[PDB]
């Protein structure tokens, strides 16, 4: 929750599970950050498209 | 006759150069309006095709 970053806490949980279990093992895959980057990607596409469009329109 | 049509092409090519000479600046803004357009056309076509490649 919190809007909290996926990049954080997983390392906290990393040591956490490295503790509650005697050895690192959980080997979990990262969340949300992939959503973060794909969001940046799609919005980036919005940037390219909308910007070139609007520039062309200004040229109009 | 097509003789006066092609002679029309080149002689009114000269007449065109003169009419543009009447407004080189207007001609400039006009042609630029063309240029940015088509250049952007081929631009986006090629780049999109390339990224697609």
Question: How does this structure look, described?
Answer:
- The structure is cut from a larger assembly and holds two copies of chain A.
- With 60 residues, the first copy, chain A, is mainly α.
- Helices cover 63% and strands 0% of the residues of chain A.
- The first copy, chain A, is built from two helices and no strands.
- At the A-B interface, helix 2 of A face helix 2 of B.
Give the helices and strands, then pairings.
This is part of a larger assembly, with two copies of chain A.
Chain A: H1 10-20, H2 33-59
Distance between the termini of chain A: 47 Å
Largest β-sheet summary of chain A: none
Instruction: Name the biggest interface.
Output: A-B, 4 and 5 residues
Please state the oligomeric state of the protein chains shown. part of a larger assembly
Roughly how many Å is the radius of gyration of chain A? 20 Å
Structure at a glance:
This is part of a larger assembly, with 2 copies of chain A. The first copy, chain A, is mostly helical and 60 residues long.
């Amino acid at each position: 929750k919190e809007g909290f970053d996926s990049a954080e806490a997983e390392q906290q949980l990393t040591r956490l599970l490295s503790l509650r279990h005697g050895k690192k093992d959980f080997f979990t895959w990262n969340m949300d950050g992939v959503l973060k980057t794909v969001e940046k990607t799609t919005r980036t596409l919005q940037l390219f498209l909308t910007l070139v469009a609007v520039i062309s329109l200004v040229v109009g | 006759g097509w003789r006066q049509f092609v002679s029309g092409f080149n002689e009114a090519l000269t007449m065109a150069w003169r009419a543009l000479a009447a407004n080189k600046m207007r001609t400039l803004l006009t042609m630029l309006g063309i240029i940015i357009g088509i250049a952007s056309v081929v631009s986006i076509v090629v780049v999109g095709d390339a990224a697609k490649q």
